[PDB]
Design an enzyme around this catalytic site. Structure first.
Site, PDB file in Angstrom:
ATOM      1  N   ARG A 153      26.653 -20.198 -31.546  1.00 28.63           N
ATOM      2  CA  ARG A 153      25.834 -19.261 -32.307  1.00 28.63           C
ATOM      3  C   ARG A 153      25.347 -19.834 -33.624  1.00 28.63           C
ATOM      4  O   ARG A 153      24.290 -19.447 -34.127  1.00 28.63           O
ATOM      5  CB  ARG A 153      26.627 -17.973 -32.560  1.00 28.63           C
ATOM      6  CG  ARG A 153      26.154 -17.168 -33.763  1.00 28.63           C
ATOM      7  CD  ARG A 153      26.845 -15.821 -33.840  1.00 28.63           C
ATOM      8  NE  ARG A 153      26.787 -15.257 -35.186  1.00 28.63           N
ATOM      9  CZ  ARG A 153      27.163 -14.021 -35.490  1.00 28.63           C
ATOM     10  NH1 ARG A 153      27.619 -13.213 -34.540  1.00 28.63           N
ATOM     11  NH2 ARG A 153      27.096 -13.592 -36.745  1.00 28.63           N
ATOM     12  N   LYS A 158      21.291   2.229 -37.325  1.00 27.93           N
ATOM     13  CA  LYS A 158      21.662   0.850 -37.189  1.00 27.93           C
ATOM     14  C   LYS A 158      22.397   0.609 -35.908  1.00 27.93           C
ATOM     15  O   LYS A 158      23.392   1.261 -35.615  1.00 27.93           O
ATOM     16  CB  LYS A 158      22.497   0.304 -38.331  1.00 27.93           C
ATOM     17  CG  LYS A 158      22.815  -1.152 -38.028  1.00 27.93           C
ATOM     18  CD  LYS A 158      23.616  -1.853 -39.083  1.00 27.93           C
ATOM     19  CE  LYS A 158      22.937  -3.152 -39.452  1.00 27.93           C
ATOM     20  NZ  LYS A 158      23.166  -4.200 -38.489  1.00 27.93           N
ATOM     21  N   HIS A 195      20.153  -4.979 -46.422  1.00 31.87           N
ATOM     22  CA  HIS A 195      21.174  -5.233 -45.429  1.00 31.87           C
ATOM     23  C   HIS A 195      22.541  -5.211 -46.071  1.00 31.87           C
ATOM     24  O   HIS A 195      23.343  -6.131 -45.925  1.00 31.87           O
ATOM     25  CB  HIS A 195      20.920  -6.565 -44.730  1.00 31.87           C
ATOM     26  CG  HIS A 195      21.692  -6.737 -43.458  1.00 31.87           C
ATOM     27  ND1 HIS A 195      21.503  -7.810 -42.612  1.00 31.87           N
ATOM     28  CD2 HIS A 195      22.646  -5.966 -42.878  1.00 31.87           C
ATOM     29  CE1 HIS A 195      22.305  -7.690 -41.567  1.00 31.87           C
ATOM     30  NE2 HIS A 195      23.009  -6.581 -41.705  1.00 31.87           N
ATOM     31  N   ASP A 205      23.581  -8.886 -46.539  1.00 32.75           N
ATOM     32  CA  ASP A 205      24.743  -8.634 -45.685  1.00 32.75           C
ATOM     33  C   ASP A 205      26.009  -8.614 -46.488  1.00 32.75           C
ATOM     34  O   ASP A 205      27.082  -8.955 -45.999  1.00 32.75           O
ATOM     35  CB  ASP A 205      24.861  -9.704 -44.601  1.00 32.75           C
ATOM     36  CG  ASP A 205      24.044  -9.381 -43.375  1.00 32.75           C
ATOM     37  OD1 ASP A 205      24.562  -8.630 -42.518  1.00 32.75           O
ATOM     38  OD2 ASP A 205      22.893  -9.872 -43.275  1.00 32.75           O
ATOM     39  N   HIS A 220      21.161  -5.362 -34.597  1.00 37.01           N
ATOM     40  CA  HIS A 220      21.944  -6.589 -34.528  1.00 37.01           C
ATOM     41  C   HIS A 220      22.173  -6.909 -33.067  1.00 37.01           C
ATOM     42  O   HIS A 220      23.187  -6.540 -32.470  1.00 37.01           O
ATOM     43  CB  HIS A 220      23.277  -6.424 -35.278  1.00 37.01           C
ATOM     44  CG  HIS A 220      24.121  -7.665 -35.319  1.00 37.01           C
ATOM     45  ND1 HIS A 220      24.919  -7.980 -36.398  1.00 37.01           N
ATOM     46  CD2 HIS A 220      24.327  -8.644 -34.404  1.00 37.01           C
ATOM     47  CE1 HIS A 220      25.579  -9.098 -36.145  1.00 37.01           C
ATOM     48  NE2 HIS A 220      25.237  -9.521 -34.942  1.00 37.01           N
ATOM     49  N   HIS A 253      24.576  -1.864 -34.084  1.00 37.96           N
ATOM     50  CA  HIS A 253      25.381  -3.075 -34.229  1.00 37.96           C
ATOM     51  C   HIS A 253      26.222  -3.472 -33.039  1.00 37.96           C
ATOM     52  O   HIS A 253      26.904  -2.660 -32.418  1.00 37.96           O
ATOM     53  CB  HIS A 253      26.290  -2.996 -35.457  1.00 37.96           C
ATOM     54  CG  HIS A 253      26.836  -4.325 -35.878  1.00 37.96           C
ATOM     55  ND1 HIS A 253      27.571  -5.132 -35.033  1.00 37.96           N
ATOM     56  CD2 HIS A 253      26.722  -5.008 -37.042  1.00 37.96           C
ATOM     57  CE1 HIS A 253      27.883  -6.253 -35.660  1.00 37.96           C
ATOM     58  NE2 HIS A 253      27.379  -6.203 -36.880  1.00 37.96           N
ATOM     59  N   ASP A 266      29.035  -4.878 -32.657  1.00 36.81           N
ATOM     60  CA  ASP A 266      30.415  -4.440 -32.615  1.00 36.81           C
ATOM     61  C   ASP A 266      30.586  -3.030 -32.106  1.00 36.81           C
ATOM     62  O   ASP A 266      31.663  -2.659 -31.634  1.00 36.81           O
ATOM     63  CB  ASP A 266      31.050  -4.609 -33.994  1.00 36.81           C
ATOM     64  CG  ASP A 266      31.209  -6.074 -34.374  1.00 36.81           C
ATOM     65  OD1 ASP A 266      30.201  -6.805 -34.296  1.00 36.81           O
ATOM     66  OD2 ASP A 266      32.329  -6.496 -34.739  1.00 36.81           O
ATOM     67  N   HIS A 285      33.572  -9.856 -36.971  1.00 29.57           N
ATOM     68  CA  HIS A 285      33.658  -9.291 -35.628  1.00 29.57           C
ATOM     69  C   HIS A 285      35.085  -9.218 -35.139  1.00 29.57           C
ATOM     70  O   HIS A 285      35.325  -9.087 -33.937  1.00 29.57           O
ATOM     71  CB  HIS A 285      32.853 -10.136 -34.627  1.00 29.57           C
ATOM     72  CG  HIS A 285      31.367 -10.069 -34.811  1.00 29.57           C
ATOM     73  ND1 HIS A 285      30.734 -10.471 -35.970  1.00 29.57           N
ATOM     74  CD2 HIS A 285      30.384  -9.680 -33.964  1.00 29.57           C
ATOM     75  CE1 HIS A 285      29.429 -10.333 -35.827  1.00 29.57           C
ATOM     76  NE2 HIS A 285      29.191  -9.855 -34.619  1.00 29.57           N
ATOM     77  N   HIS A 338      19.309 -10.735 -39.518  1.00 32.48           N
ATOM     78  CA  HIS A 338      19.693 -12.119 -39.225  1.00 32.48           C
ATOM     79  C   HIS A 338      19.026 -12.636 -37.989  1.00 32.48           C
ATOM     80  O   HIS A 338      19.619 -13.365 -37.190  1.00 32.48           O
ATOM     81  CB  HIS A 338      21.222 -12.276 -39.114  1.00 32.48           C
ATOM     82  CG  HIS A 338      21.917 -11.106 -38.488  1.00 32.48           C
ATOM     83  ND1 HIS A 338      21.618 -10.649 -37.221  1.00 32.48           N
ATOM     84  CD2 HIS A 338      22.885 -10.285 -38.965  1.00 32.48           C
ATOM     85  CE1 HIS A 338      22.367  -9.595 -36.947  1.00 32.48           C
ATOM     86  NE2 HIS A 338      23.144  -9.351 -37.987  1.00 32.48           N
ATOM     87  N   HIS A 394      26.297  -4.002 -46.704  1.00 30.93           N
ATOM     88  CA  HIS A 394      27.503  -3.504 -46.041  1.00 30.93           C
ATOM     89  C   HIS A 394      28.370  -2.873 -47.118  1.00 30.93           C
ATOM     90  O   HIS A 394      29.078  -3.591 -47.829  1.00 30.93           O
ATOM     91  CB  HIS A 394      28.296  -4.656 -45.377  1.00 30.93           C
ATOM     92  CG  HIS A 394      27.672  -5.219 -44.131  1.00 30.93           C
ATOM     93  ND1 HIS A 394      28.182  -4.984 -42.871  1.00 30.93           N
ATOM     94  CD2 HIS A 394      26.589  -6.014 -43.954  1.00 30.93           C
ATOM     95  CE1 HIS A 394      27.439  -5.605 -41.972  1.00 30.93           C
ATOM     96  NE2 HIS A 394      26.464  -6.235 -42.603  1.00 30.93           N
TER      97      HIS A 394
HETATM   98 NI    NI Z   1      25.460  -7.377 -40.929  1.00 29.97          NI
HETATM   99 NI    NI Z   2      25.224  -8.209 -38.986  1.00 33.36          NI
END
Ligand code: NI
Ligand code: NI
Ligand code: NI
Ligand code: NI
Ligand code: NI
Ligand code: NI
Lengths: 569, 238, 569, 342, 238
Positions: free
Chosen positions: A338, A219, A136, A362, A248, A221, A223, A322, A274, A138
Site C-alpha cells: 500500500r 464518511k 480531514h 488526517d 476511504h 471508512h 474500518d 487500522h 488520501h 480526526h
Molecule cells: Ni483518515
Molecule cells: Ni483515512
C-alpha cells in the site's frame, strides 16, 4: 505632485504593483498584480501618521463606518495576488479597496469609510490570506484545534468523538447522540467546526437522522465497511439532504475494486481522501480515481512532499490506525502492499497538474494537523524546482502556481463541503477569517489569526514587558478567544435539515450556526485551478501511474523549504 | 346594450383611428400611433361590413398608407400591425405585415453592428454523424438537447453521440422529415456535464462508464442505433 | 465550433460587443462596451429553444435558484453600457452575468442559476435600464403617479397633500399629521414614495418632529418664507437626523441674495431645485449656485430642452404656482424678471458640462411629471447636435455622454436623497426596479415597468385577443400592481428616526419600508459624471451666464427628438 | 323571511359560472373580461406579460407563487395556479404544490420530456393534484406513443388536444380517445369557419418565440395547423370525444370567447348533423347539457373543485349567472359571486 | 401603440371638442364645457400640424368663437382656457385668455359688492421712511415681514423701523429696483409682537431693549442703515 522612490515607498506602504515577493524561504515568487490605492493618499496609522481625527478618519463617516481596517495589505487569494485596504464590519469583509475619509480622500467608497469607531490595523509589508480549512480532521484530541489554529487554519471539518478507536481510524462522529456531545463540546473552541457522520450503513433511516442531527455530511471508512451497499445508500441520502460525502476506498478489495466503488458512486459527487493511496484505499489503483469528473480528489499529508524519508516512515502508521497489530499474518502483507513509492511520487506532480485539488491532514491518523499549509507550499516550491515555472504562468513570477496551491486548502475545500459562501477566500461579504503572514515566515509561521473579524490569537511576547515584541514570543490566545466573545466569532456548521429543525436552540448552541449548501451540484470542474480531468491508469505490476498516456512521477527530495529554518523542533 | 370591456376598447381605438384619418386628410404626415390606429381601425370596419375576408384584409391593409403619407421613421417602426375584428364567422386575427416602406432615410433605434462573424462554441471539436428518420413523423432536435437521447426514430450511432449537442446557434434546431437522412454536427456538452432528464437514459455524470448504462437502456427501450447487449454486466445502481 | 454572422447573431441574441445602438430617433449613439455571454451558450426561451428541463434549466439548481431571468439584455447604466443576463431573486438583482445551467454550461455562477422555479423573460434586442427617480414631485393629484410610472419612473420623492395651494406651490407635506395621511395613502400606489417636510420654520422642535414622523427630509420654499433663519434651522436639524434638504431660493431677494443664502447653507449639503432660475429663485444669479461644491444642482423641466416656444410659455405658469394673480402690480414685475432666455439657454450646456446633476419635474407645478426622462434625452441629443461628441468620449460613440444624461434621473437623484443603496442603478444587490426599453422608443415609451422584481405595468393589448400584441396597445397594470402584491413590491422611504421609532407599525404600513441614509456626507463631487465644480457668474445687466471665465449659452431649437414621432398627442 | 332579499328570475335562464381552466396569466385585464362572459373561475399558471407566461400557463417556483396568490387577492374571480411540471427534480416539484399550486403544467417551451412528464406525474399522484400537458410537438424526445407511455395511464388533462393549440404532430388529437385522458379543446379553432385556418399561421410566432424568419421555425409552424384535425374537433366535441373548452387567454385563445364558442360550435353541429340520437322529445336538451358541462362541471372535476363549484346544485358555492334568453351564450345579465352580486 | 394615460386623456378631450363643434354647426349656442373643449381641442390639432407657434395659438384661439356663438353667461365664465399640446419642439402650454365677450347681460356668480372703502390696519399710526436700493439686484419686501430685517441692501434707518411692517394690503409687497429710492409706509407689528426668524436679528419680543441687540447684530452683519457700535455693552444672552 512630488515623486518618491520605490525603495522608500515600499518600506512605507509595502510591495506595490510590479513588485515581487518571495514566499518564505521557498523559490516561489509572488508578484503584486494590482493595487487599489491612490499614491499619496495611502493609509498609515501612528504618532503623527494619517489615521487621525478629521484626517484619514472621517468626522462625518458613512453609515457603514468600518469596524477595523487592515491598511496596505498584500492579498494572496485565488482571486488575485494584489494590493489594497481590507475592511471589516460586523465580523465580515465589508470592503476590499481604498477606503479612508471621503472628506479628504479622492476615491473612498462608503463601503470602506474610516470613522471614530474603526480600529486600525497595519498590514503594509505583510501578506493577508484567508484561513485554511483542513477537512480531514480526526477529532482524536481537543489539542489539535489550537495547533492547527497556529498554522493558519480557521476551519476544521471532520468526524470523531475523542481518543476512541473508531475515531483514531476514521473521521466519523457516529449517531446523533455523539453528535450532540461534539457540537456541545465545539462550543469550547476557537475554530469553525463541522462534523461528519457514519456513511457506513445500509440503513437509510439511520443514515438520515445523523444529518438531521447536525452532521454536515457522511464518511465512508474502510474500518467500518466501505461496501458498495453502504456506499450507495450513503450517497443517496446525501443527495436528498444536500450534504457532502467523503470516502476511504475499500483497500482489501474484498467487496470489489475501484471499478466497483466508482460504479457505486454512480457518478455522484464524492470527496475522496488520501486518494493517492498511502492514506488508504483500493490497492493499487485508487489514485486513478482523481482523474474522474464526479470526484473531489484530496491528498492526505505525510506523503507530501516527497522526501527520502517518506516511504521509510509509513510502514508503521498503518498499525496505529487500522488496529493492524504488528504481528498477525494477513495484516503484515497488505500494509506493505500500500505504501507504493510509485503513487506517492506522482502525487506531487498530480498536485501540480491540477489532478489533485485538496490537501487534508488526517490529524493524528497519518497526518500532521499542523503541517497542512506548510507542506502544501513545500510541495509547490519543490515542484517548481524540478519542473520550473508553469506554462500557464505569465510574467516573471509564479502567481498562477501560487493561486493553485493556495486554493487547495482554502476555496477548494470550502466548496467541497458547501461553505464557500461564508468562508474560504478573501472576498467581500464572507466571514472575516483572516491571517496576516510576514513574508519571511509565509507558509509556516503566521503573525496573527483573526477569527470572525476580531483577533483570536497572535504572536505575543513577554506579557509583562513595555511592548508586545520582546521574547518569549510564541502564540498567545487573544480576546476573541475568550468569554462570550468566542461564541460570536465562531461558526459550527450543520445541515439545512438540522438548521431548520432548530438544532441551535435544540442543543443550546451559543455559537454562530450556519447550514451547508450546494454539495451535490458540484464536480471536479468546480475546483479552482485544480480543475483538471484526465483518464489515468496504474500498472498492476510496476505500479507506475499514467495520465492521458504519459507517465507522472516526481523525484524524491533530500531537503525541503519551510523546515528546520524556522522551528527549534 | 351590455358593453363588454372588450367593446369599449375598440370604440376607443376606432376614434383613435378617426383622428388619424382626419389628420392626414388635413395634409399631415402620420406618426407611429396615428398609422397603427388608422390601419387597425380600418380592418375593424371592414370586418364589420362582413365583405372582405381575413386573408384579404391581412393584405389590403398594406394598401392604406403610402410611404409619403407617414413621418420619417414611422415606416421602419411599424414592423406589423395586429388587430382582431369580428367577422360574420366570428372574431379573427388580421395581422397586417409591413404596411409601409423605407421611403425615408431615418430609422429609430437602428442597428450599427460591426461587420464580422462570431464563432459559436469556441474550441469545441465537432463531429459529424449520419442521421436518418426511419419514422412516419418529423422530428426537430434542439441546440442543448442530449442528442444521444433523441426520439427513438433517428437512426444513428447513439454511442458516438453520448454526451453531445448539435453544434449550432444556441437555441435553434435541426429538422428531420420522415425519411430524410443527414449528418449532424455535435460537440460535447460543457459545464459539469451532468445529464439529468430528457429520456431518462443518463440522469448522472457524462462518464464513459455511465455511458454503458445509457447504451444498455436505449437498447431495451428501442432507440435505433443503440448497439446491442453483448452480455451486459449489471451494476449495483442503475 | 462553427461560426455565425453578426447579421444573424444579433437578430438572435441582440447587439453584442462593438455593436452600436441608436437611442430612439435621437442622434445619440450607444455602443456595447462588454458582454458576459459565452457565444454558443446564450439563453433563449421558446418552443424548442434553450431554457428547458435538464438543458439551460438545471434539474439540480443551486440553492440560489433565480426567480426570474432577463435573457440577453443590453444594459445601459452609469456603470457601463454592456451586454449580459440579469437575474432576479426575492425582489432584487441577484446577479448580472451569464447564468444558465452549470450541469451543461461552462460559466454559470450559482448566483445566476436557472431552475424549475425561475421564470423566463426575453430581453435580447431590448435595452434594460433602472427606473428613473423624479425627486421634485408636487403631490397635487394621485393621477401623476401612474403617468410618471408609464415614463420609466419607479421612484417619486416630493412633498404635498393633494390639490391644496400649499402643495400647488411647494413640494411639502407639512406636519406629522398630514404626513400620516400621505404615508397611509401611499399604500395605494405602485411607485416608491418618500415625502419632504416644511423646512420653512425657525422652530427646531417643530422641525424635528416631521422627520421623526416619516419625512425623508425638508424643503425650503419661497412661498413659505425661505429666510436665512429658516434655512439655517432646517439645515442643522437635517444634519442631526441624516436626511436630505431641498431649496427654492428667495426670489424677491427680500431677506438677501444668493450671497446670503449660500452663506446660510454654511457649506452644508443642499439639493437645489430649478437652479437655472425659471423654476424659481434668487434673480438673477442663483444658477450660479450650481457651480459650488456643497450644492446638489437640479434642473426643473419645462425650460428643457431649449426650444423656440420655451420662453413664450413660462410667462403664465408663475401665476398658477405662487398665487401671482394676473393683475396686481408687484406681481406683474418680477414674474417677468425671472424667465431669462439667458439662464434658460446655458442650462442645456451646463447639463452637458456636468454643471447640473439632476433632472426633476415639478409635477403640475411648472413641469411635466411624464416628461422627465424624455427631455433629459432630447436635451442630450440636442447638445450633441450643436456641440458634437465630447472630449471624454472614446470610440465612435456617445457612451460617456449617455452615461451622463442617464445618471441624471437615476443614480444621482438616488444619492441626493440617501437611497442609492436600494435603488437607482442596475447593480447586484439593489432593488429590482427595472424597465425594458425597445431601442426604437427609448427615452419616451418603455415596454414594461417591473417593480421590485415583478411586473407591475407593461404595454398590453386587446385583453380578449389570442395574443398580447394586438391593439389597442396601451399601458395596462400588471399583477405586481394589485392585491397584497403591491405591498411587497413597493418601498415607502422614511428616516432612521422614524424607522427606529417603528413608523411602519405605528401607521400600519404594509408596504416595504426602508430608511434614508448618508445625506449629509455627500457633495457635488458625489454626482456621477456630473461632478464638475466651477465658479460661475451672471451679469446683473445682460444676465449672461459665465463659467470659469468663458460664456455658456445654447442655441434655441425649432424641433426636438422623441416628440411628435411617438404620441398622438 | 325579513332577512331574505328578493331577486326576480322569471323569464331568465340561471346557470352556474363557467370555469376556464387554460388561463395564461399574462395581464390582470383578462380577469374582468372573462368575468363579463359568464366565467367565475379561472385556473391557469403565469406571472404577468413575461415570456415564460406568454408561452405557457405556469407560475414557476414558490416565490412567484406567493406573488400571484397575493395578487389574486385583488380580483373578483376564483383563482388557482399551476406549477412547472417541467422538471425532473422531484424535490423542486413538490415544493410548488406545498406552495399553493393546485397542480402542474408540462409545456413544450419548457421541455415536455418523458422524464419531466413522468416525474411530474408521480409527485402529482402523491399530492392528489391535477396535471395539464402540452405535448412534445417537435417530436424530439419521441411521439405521442412515448408521451402516452409516459403518462403510464395516470390521469392527465390535455390541452389543445386537437393540435393547433400545440402538440405531437400530427397524431395527438388521437389522445382524446383514451380513458386516462382529460381531453380539452383550445379556443380559436372553434368553431370551424372559413377564416380559422387563415388565422393561426401567425399566432405560433407570438407564443413559442417562433421569430418570423428562422428556417427550422418556418417549417413545423406550418405543419401543425391542419385543417384536418381542426375540422374533426367540432365533431369530436359533439361525439363526447372532447370534454373541456379552454381559452388559453392571450396565447392562441380568447379569454372572453369560451362560452360563446362552445355554444356556436353546438349550434353549428346541430345544423350539419341535426339533433342527436340520445335526444328525447322535440328539443336539444341532451346536446345542451353536453356543451354546457364542457365549461362548468367537467373542468371543475378536472381540477378537483367540483365539490364547491361547477354546477347549480345545493351545497355548492353560489357562483351564478342570470342569462336573458335572447343573449344566452354571449351577454349575461349579471354575475353573482359567492351568493352576492359582483 | 403604447398609449400613455396622457394620450387617452386627449383623445377623449378631442372628441369632447368634436361634439362641441358639431353642435354649434347645427346652430346651437355653446355652453361652458362645449366652448372650453372646442377652444382647447383646436389648439391640439394646430400644434399637431406643426405650423402655428405657441405665441400665436395663444392669440388665435381668441378668434374661434364669437360672442353670439355661446350661451349667455359662458363668456363671463371662461376667464381663460389653458391647454398643453405637443409642438414639433415639444409639449407646450398654450394659455388662451378671455376667448369670448360680454355680448350678454348675464354673469353667473356675479359680484354685487357694496361700494365704499375698507380701511386696512385700523388705527395704526404709520410712518414714512426713505429707502434706496444700493444693490445691483431688485428687492420685493412683503406685508407682514419685519422690515427692519430686510435685505442688507435697502439702505434706510433700520432703527426707525424696528418691529414694523409695510402698512399695505395684507399679502402684497413693495418693489425696489437696483438704485430706486422711496419712502415706505410701515406700521408696528401687532399680536404679541414676537419676532422670530427672518434674518435672526430679533428672535424675541419686540422690546426697546431687544432692539439694542438687533441694531447691534445688523451692524456686524452689514445691513445698511444699521447705525453703529458706540461702545456696545453686551448682555448675558444674545
Ligand atoms: Ni483518515
Ligand atoms: Ni483515512
Ligand atoms: Ni419650485
Ligand atoms: Ni417646485
Ligand atoms: Ni399551449
Ligand atoms: Ni397554452
Amino acid at each position: 505632485m512630488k515623486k518618491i522612490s520605490r525603495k522608500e515607498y515600499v518600506s512605507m506602504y509595502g510591495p506595490t504593483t510590479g513588485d515581487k515577493v518571495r514566499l518564505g524561504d521557498t523559490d516561489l515568487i509572488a508578484e503584486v498584480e494590482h493595487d487599489y490605492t491612490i499614491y499619496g493618499e495611502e493609509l498609515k496609522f501612528g504618532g503623527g501618521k494619517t489615521l487621525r481625527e478629521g484626517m484619514s478618519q472621517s468626522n462625518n463617516p458613512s453609515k457603514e463606518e468600518l469596524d477595523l481596517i487592515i491598511t496596505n495589505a498584500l492579498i494572496v487569494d485565488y482571486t488575485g495576488i494584489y494590493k489594497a485596504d481590507i475592511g471589516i464590519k460586523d465580523g465580515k469583509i465589508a470592503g476590499i479597496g481604498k477606503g479612508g475619509n471621503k472628506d479628504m480622500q479622492d476615491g473612498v467608497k462608503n463601503n470602506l469609510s474610516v470613522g471614530p469607531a474603526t480600529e486600525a490595523l497595519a498590514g503594509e509589508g505583510l501578506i493577508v490570506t484567508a484561513g485554511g480549512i483542513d477537512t480531514h480532521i480526526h477529532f482524536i484530541s481537543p489539542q489539535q484545534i489550537p495547533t492547527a489554529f497556529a498554522s493558519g487554519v480557521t476551519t476544521m471539518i471532520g468526524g470523531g468523538t475523542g481518543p476512541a478507536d473508531g475515531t483514531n481510524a476514521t473521521t466519523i462522529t457516529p449517531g446523533r447522540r455523539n453528535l450532540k456531545w461534539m457540537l456541545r463540546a465545539a462550543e469550547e473552541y476557537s475554530m469553525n467546526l463541522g462534523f461528519l457522520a457514519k456513511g457506513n450503513a445500509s440503513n437509510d433511516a439511520s443514515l438520515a437522522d445523523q444529518i438531521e442531527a447536525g452532521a454536515i455530511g457522511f464518511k465512508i471508512h474502510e474500518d467500518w465497511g466501505t461496501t458498495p451497499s453502504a456506499i450507495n445508500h450513503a450517497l443517496d441520502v446525501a443527495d436528498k439532504y444536500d450534504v457532502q460525502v467523503a470516502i476511504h476506498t475499500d483497500t482489501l478489495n474484498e467487496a470489489g475494486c475501484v471499478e466497483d466503488t466508482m460504479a457505486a458512486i454512480a457518478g455522484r459527487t464524492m470527496h475522496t481522501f488520501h486518494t493517492e493511496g498511502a492514506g488508504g484505499g483500493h490497492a493499487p489503483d485508487i489514485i486513478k480515481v482523481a482523474g474522474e469528473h464526479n470526484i473531489l480528489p484530496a491528498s492526505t499529508n505525510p506523503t507530501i512532499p516527497f522526501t527520502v524519508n517518506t516511504e521509510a516512515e509509513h510502514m508503521d502508521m498503518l498499525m496505529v490506525c487500522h488496529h493492524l497489530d504488528k504481528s498477525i499474518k494477513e495484516d503484515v502483507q497488505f500494509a506493505d502492499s500500500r505504501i507504493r513509492p510509485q503513487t506517492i511520487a506522482a502525487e506531487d506532480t498530480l498536485h501540480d497538474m491540477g489532478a489533485f485539488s485538496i490537501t487534508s491532514s488526517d490529524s493524528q491518523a497519518m497526518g500532521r494537523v499542523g503541517e497542512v499549509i506548510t507542506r502544501t507550499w513545500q510541495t509547490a516550491d519543490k515542484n517548481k524546482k524540478e519542473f520550473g515555472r508553469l506554462k500557464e504562468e505569465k510574467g516573471d513570477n509564479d502567481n498562477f502556481r501560487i493561486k493553485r496551491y493556495l486554493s487547495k486548502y482554502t476555496i477548494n475545500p470550502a466548496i467541497a463541503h458547501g461553505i464557500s459562501e461564508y468562508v474560504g477566500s478573501v472576498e467581500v461579504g464572507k466571514v472575516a477569517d483572516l491571517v496576516l503572514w510576514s513574508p519571511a515566515f509565509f507558509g509556516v509561521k503566521p503573525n496573527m489569526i483573526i477569527k470572525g473579524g476580531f483577533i483570536a490569537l497572535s504572536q505575543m511576547g513577554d506579557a509583562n514587558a513595555s511592548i508586545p515584541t520582546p521574547q518569549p514570543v510564541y502564540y498567545r490566545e487573544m480576546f476573541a478567544h475568550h468569554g462570550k466573545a468566542k461564541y460570536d466569532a465562531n461558526i459550527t456548521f450543520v445541515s439545512q435539515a438540522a438548521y431548520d429543525k432548530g438544532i441551535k436552540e435544540e442543543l443550546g448552541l451559543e455559537r454562530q450556526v450556519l447550514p451547508v449548501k450546494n454539495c451535490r451540484n458540484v464536480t471536479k470542474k468546480d475546483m479552482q485551478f485544480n480543475n483538471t480531468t484526465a483518464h489515468i491508469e496504474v500498472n498492476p505490476e510496476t505500479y507506475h501511474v499514467f495520465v492521458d498516456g504519459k507517465e507522472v512521477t516526481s523525484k524524491p527530495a533530500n531537503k525541503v523549504s519551510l523546515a528546520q529554518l524556522f522551528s527549534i523542533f | 346594450m351590455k358593453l363588454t370591456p372588450k367593446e369599449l376598447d375598440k370604440l376607443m381605438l376606432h376614434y383613435a383611428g378617426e383622428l388619424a384619418k382626419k389628420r392626414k386628410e388635413k395634409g399631415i404626415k402620420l406618426n407611429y400611433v396615428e398609422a397603427v390606429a388608422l390601419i387597425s381601425a380600418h380592418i375593424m370596419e371592414e370586418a364589420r361590413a362582413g365583405k372582405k375576408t381575413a386573408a384579404e384584409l391581412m393584405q389590403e391593409g398594406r394598401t392604406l398608407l403610402k410611404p409619403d403619407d407617414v413621418m420619417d421613421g414611422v415606416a421602419s417602426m411599424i414592423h406589423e400591425v395586429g388587430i382582431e375584428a369580428m367577422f360574420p364567422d366570428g372574431t379573427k386575427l388580421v395581422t397586417v405585415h409591413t404596411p409601409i416602406e423605407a421611403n425615408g432615410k431615418l430609422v429609430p433605434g437602428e442597428l450599427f453592428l460591426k461587420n464580422e462573424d462570431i464563432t459559436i462554441n469556441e474550441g469545441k471539436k465537432a463531429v459529424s454523424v449520419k442521421v436518418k428518420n426511419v419514422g412516419d413523423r418529423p422530428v426537430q432536435i434542439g441546440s442543448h438537447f442530449h442528442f444521444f437521447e433523441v426520439n427513438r426514430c433517428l437512426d444513428f450511432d447513439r454511442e458516438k453521440t453520448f454526451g453531445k449537442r448539435l453544434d449550432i446557434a444556441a437555441g435553434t434546431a435541426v429538422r428531420f422529415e420522415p425519411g430524410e437522412e443527414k449528418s449532424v454536427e455535435l460537440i460535447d456538452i460543457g459545464g459539469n456535464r451532468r445529464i439529468f432528464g430528457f429520456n431518462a437514459l443518463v440522469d448522472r455524470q457524462a462518464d464513459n462508464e455511465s455511458k454503458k448504462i445509457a447504451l444498455h437502456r436505449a437498447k431495451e427501450r428501442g432507440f435505433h442505433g443503440a448497439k446491442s447487449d453483448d452480455n451486459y454486466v449489471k451494476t449495483i445502481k442503475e
